[PDB]
Amino acid sequence: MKLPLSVKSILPVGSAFRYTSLCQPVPFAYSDPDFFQDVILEFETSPKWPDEITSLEKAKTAFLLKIQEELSANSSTYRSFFSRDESIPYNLEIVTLNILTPEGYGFKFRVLTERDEILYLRA
Amino acid sequence: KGISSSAIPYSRNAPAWFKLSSESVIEQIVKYARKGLTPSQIGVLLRDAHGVTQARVITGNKIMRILKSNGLAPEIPEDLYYLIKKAVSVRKHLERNRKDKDAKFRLILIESRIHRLARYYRTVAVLPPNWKYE
Amino acid sequence: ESSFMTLFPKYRESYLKTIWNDVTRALDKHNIACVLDLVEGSMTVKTTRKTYDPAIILKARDLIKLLARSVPFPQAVKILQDDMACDVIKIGNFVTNKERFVKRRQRLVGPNGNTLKALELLTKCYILVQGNTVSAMGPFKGLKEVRRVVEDCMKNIHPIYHIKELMIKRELAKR
Amino acid sequence: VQDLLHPTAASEARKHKLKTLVQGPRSYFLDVKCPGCLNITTVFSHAQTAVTCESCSTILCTPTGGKAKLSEGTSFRRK
Amino acid sequence: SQVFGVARIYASFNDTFVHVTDLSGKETIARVTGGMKVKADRDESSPYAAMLAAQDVAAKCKEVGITAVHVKIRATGGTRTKTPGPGGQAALRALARSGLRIGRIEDVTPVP
Amino acid sequence: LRVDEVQGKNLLTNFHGMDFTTDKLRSMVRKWQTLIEANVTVKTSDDYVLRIFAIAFTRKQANQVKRHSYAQSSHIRAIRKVISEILTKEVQGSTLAQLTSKLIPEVINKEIENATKDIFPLQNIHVRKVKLLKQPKFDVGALMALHG
Amino acid sequence: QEDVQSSIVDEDGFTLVV
RNA sequence: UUAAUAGGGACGGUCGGGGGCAUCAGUAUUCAAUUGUCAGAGGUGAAAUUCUUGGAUUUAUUGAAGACUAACUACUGCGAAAGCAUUUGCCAAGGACGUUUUCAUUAAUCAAGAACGAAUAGGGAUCGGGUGGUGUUUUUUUAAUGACCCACU
């Protein structure tokens, strides 16, 4: 897809990708908590990342809004919504992108940058 | 050929705003001198760390004179010291390397400047005669 | 499908811009596309779906190659024929000195541009010593002859043995 | 296009420092305020050394070939 | 659509070499060359000799099954002439007429 | 490509090398500019040892006046070093197929681009080669994980 | 904008040396 | 008594295809081996010499030996000259620039002799350094190194 930044890397780090999901991955069986697979989204090295964590994560979320715009624009078999992630405490704006597939699987996208470690070490 | 040097000003008094006296500086010289710094690097260290226009303005003597009077005069003039140090170090680079014929041309240009300076200093008697740098 | 392209320095540019319409006519003789990009300084020859023969595009490559070496355009359009062979030999890689490159360069070109043109009487070719190359067009036998003469002349072999050589050979084929 | 007696200071100041009528320097002094302390030191405009402050021995300026770079902790008076 | 190969035309001076291979390039078929098709030891790169051998090379390849083929033109290379030979243009024109397919071709001159 | 396994009017192959055509790089090399190259020997996650090359060219900026815009012969040291540390970071991760999945959209070139721009800007940079010499073992186990 | 940003970040400067 | 638009020396960022040692890469040539394959391959204006079914030539895979840095590569740089083009490390040497550091006539030119080598005043462009900037660009990062635009030397 064409974005304001070219895609650096998209990394699957879900448990099903390392064969550790307690239930085997069943299509459309979302009642099990192992269903949504965690995927890191890393964009290219760029100075477009603000030096404050709220504007950083909201910038990530607005990038996920543009990806949701292209995705709902041209990938109508896929489904998608947005969720919160309070499993990182006090970082109240991490929004995961949830995509439901016609193979019966669900993923979530969360953006990692280079500006994260500097701001957290600064904190 | 390349013109590059220091242009001292017109007025040989200075600076009409400096506060301290020469006694502040004369003490400052000898401690730097006994520390082990060369009289070239003294006037390096004087002009930039503190504010002095030139040490021969606040003091009516040369900086070499103050080391000569207070008993800090070295064995030789300071310029010939480095020409000794350069001549050994190239020779030391030649005792490791027998192939660098480019270096062997450079030794004579060192030695001939050493020779012509040796005749002057031994004539004007900062060095005793029969002295030789081999 | 196949797409070839090349570049030029700036002392060919405005001239190429003045002859680009006859470029697209002569290339339009064989259904060849060409694109002139100023911002890179690149010419680009391509084939289309309405193409007839593929092999002609190789000649197209040669032509834009022959516009990198400042050959006059009416002399240049001969290579789109069939019985017309091209050659680009690089003369930059023979002398480390600039002065002795100049020595056998000028001994090659001779007084007043005579001797060089004498070869073009005994080869019936076209020869352009373009700076750091020899660019030679013409028939194939002549490209053998000019390749032998140049690749002897950058070294210490004199041109007079070559022009006596081709002179005696053409006069013995006269017979 | 001029006489050698008095040229203008606009014509004079563009010239090389040696080739003037009366040769004189162009380099200057300044006072250095770095808030680790409040004492100023007279630092010559061209360093040749790594210079630190009087008591807060951290940095004042960095050596270059030409003019030294005052390392941003400074407002100054050229006197 | 078709079954593919590479034709690898080596157009040297005083000879022309054409030999179609498999997709891998280790398996050969129909190695027949231009110098074979006349006997004068002088016209070994003449284009009518190039058109002669390219017909017989496309003959046996049409009789085994290969119908589409890439060409890889190749001069003598290295410290040699770096120039495509005499029997390269008509020979590529000869086998393209035989009923085969030509697409996505390039150069394998060793230009070091 | 390189053959590993065979099964009965099917055989499976593996990625051996990647090369440019001669027409592509000889299109690029223009007069009055500087040719900067780099090479690096670097191991993958699974122990494929591979040596890639690198090509780098200098561009002119907007509103240039001079006809060449060369380098400084010390910036080339500042250019080769930035590429050298970047290439060792991206290799040894998530075996070569994902590295093949980065070589195809040439993501590597933008990482070279952004970091080294602060020295001197640049033009066309590509990868130009990758070749391998130290495959560890036969190892059918990881081979069938890519198959459907 | 810009100069105040330099002022505060190089105030993390005066905590970055000292 | 001054510190030469006399000369020597120190320091600062630098520059250089300058030099020495050591190291890495690249295709090409040749040789050897394996595989596909089987009648010519080379060469010249031909002709001839040579190799060849124990398979020449071509093709795909390797290993070996020596050699050199191909487009970029310039009326540009470096070195006193003869000369100097792959990466990287080490060892010193050198020049210009900057300098309100230092010695105080320490200077220049050249038989004999040695090392090394067959043996008048403007204009435009360019290289390196420095200075200035009613300056831009990389900066959705706070800064900044750096490239660029123009003036000055």
Side-chain angles (χ1 to χ4, degrees), chain D residues 2-23:
Chain D
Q2 78 279 14
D3 295 330
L4 194 142
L5 285 175
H6 304 94
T8 64
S11 63
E12 181 68 26
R14 69 183 66 191
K15 290 184 182 294
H16 186 269
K17 66 185 287 185
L18 286 173
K19 296 186 177 180
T20 58
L21 183 60
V22 179
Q23 60 183 356

Side-chain angles (χ1 to χ4, degrees), chain E residues 13-21 25 28-30:
Chain E
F13 292 178
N14 295 318
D15 201 2
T16 54
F17 280 162
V18 171
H19 70 287
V20 62
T21 60
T28 192
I29 171 171

Side-chain angles (χ1 to χ4, degrees), chain C residues 8-64:
Chain C
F8 46 82
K10 196 162 293 296
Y11 65 94
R12 192 60 178 170
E13 183 173 0
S14 178
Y15 178 77
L16 291 177
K17 185 177 75 173
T18 56
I19 50 94
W20 186 257
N21 282 318
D22 287 334
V23 170
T24 198
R25 291 175 192 273
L27 272 70
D28 196 2
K29 293 188 179 184
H30 294 282
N31 298 112
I32 305 300
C34 57
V35 174
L36 186 59
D37 192 3
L38 293 173
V39 71
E40 188 188 2
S42 68
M43 294 177 287
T44 299
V45 294
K46 294 190 271 75
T47 60
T48 63
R49 292 187 297 271
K50 294 182 181 181
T51 188
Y52 183 76
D53 182 71
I56 196 69
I57 200 66
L58 288 178
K59 299 294 181 69
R61 192 261 306 279
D62 297 328
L63 181 61
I64 57 171

Side-chain angles (χ1 to χ4, degrees), chain B residues 1-108:
Chain B
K1 299 294 186 291
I3 43 173
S4 172
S5 69
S6 299
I8 57 98
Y10 183 79
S11 182
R12 295 179 186 177
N13 59 355
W17 63 271
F18 182 74
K19 290 170 65 179
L20 300 176
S21 68
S22 298
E23 186 176 1
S24 298
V25 184
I26 285 170
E27 181 178 2
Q28 187 64 255
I29 287 171
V30 183
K31 183 257 291 182
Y32 286 161
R34 191 64 265 167
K35 193 171 182 180
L37 278 303
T38 63
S40 293
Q41 296 179 1
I42 300 302
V44 171
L45 192 65
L46 287 176
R47 66 172 176 86
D48 57 356
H50 296 91
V52 286
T53 66
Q54 184 58 262
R56 292 187 304 279
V57 176
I58 192 65
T59 297
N61 291 318
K62 295 181 176 67
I63 49 95
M64 191 63 205
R65 291 182 179 179
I66 305 169
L67 272 76
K68 185 258 288 181
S69 296
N70 294 321
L72 275 302
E75 69 272 19
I76 49 175
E78 59 176 357
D79 55 352
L80 199 146
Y81 182 78
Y82 300 102
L83 293 176
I84 291 172
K85 181 258 291 179
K86 188 177 291 296
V88 175
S89 180
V90 174
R91 184 181 293 274
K92 185 177 178 180
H93 183 71
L94 283 172
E95 299 303 323
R96 299 176 294 173
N97 292 319
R98 283 89 168 89
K99 189 62 64 67
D100 194 1
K101 294 292 184 181
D102 186 74
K104 190 172 182 178
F105 183 77
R106 296 292 184 183
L107 71 93
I108 299 171

